[PDB]
Structure 1
Amino acid sequence: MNPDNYLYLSALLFTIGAAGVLLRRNAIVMFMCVELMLNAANLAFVNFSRMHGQLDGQVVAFFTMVVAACEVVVGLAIIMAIFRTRRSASVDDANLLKH
């Protein structure tokens, strides 16, 4: 197998994650899709680190994991705050700000 396949998979995964953010109203599923995007980035970083014979890409993947966890937690806090008032976790429900 040619190693570049790993990148294509990432390109697919990221793409799928992006599409998910567009297609799913649930905020939690949106968080899952953002996690998919960040992990596709991590896969690309790991593949390139292997390609260049150094671990820097792996370190970046680790830091991206940290960032993904923190962003997920912040999004969960925001969604808790919204849900406690609106009793809904749909992104489309936050439609007041428009035009």
Structure 2
Amino acid sequence: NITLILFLIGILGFVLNRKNIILMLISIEIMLLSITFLILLSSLNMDDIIGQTYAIYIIVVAGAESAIGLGILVAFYRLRGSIAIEY
């Protein structure tokens, strides 16, 4: 239920955001943490180590995806000088 509210917060990041693409990455990270939080609590309720293992791979993949996205943003900033959409 906390995980649901957190997923909303990450969802609302896109709704409340016209010009801040850095907030777009952060909203994706909140959603990923919210979904991982939900898996972890469910696997504690169902006594299943596989759920914890699933969480660990999401953390790894989320970390690897943040690395790629920050890299792509740097290749974008080098030619532009702004991370701001003129809206």
Unaligned runs of 5+ in 2: none
More helix by share: 2
Task: State, as a whole percentage, how many aligned pairs show the same letter.
Answer: 31
Length, aligned pairs only = 86
1:36 to 2:30 alignment: yes
The TM-score with structure 1 as length reference comes to 0.76
How far apart are 1:88 and its partner, in Å? 1.1
CA-atom RMSD, angstroms?
A: 1.7
Residues 9-88 of structure 1: matches in 2 within 5 Å?
Answer: 9-24=2-17, 25-88=19-82
**Higher RCO (CA-CA < 8 Å; seq separation 6+):** 2
* TM-score of the pair, normalised by structure 2: 0.85
Indicate conservation of the 8 Å contact 1:27/1:79, yes or no. no
Give the 4+ runs in structure 1 shifted more than 6 A.
none
Q: Select the structure of larger CA radius of gyration.
A: 1
Cα offsets for 1:49-92 (capped at 9, x unmatched): 011111111111111111111111111111111111111113x3
Unaligned runs of 5+ in 1: 1-7
Deviations 1:5-63 (Å, cap 9, x if unpaired)?
xxx11111111112113433333322222111111111100111011111111111111
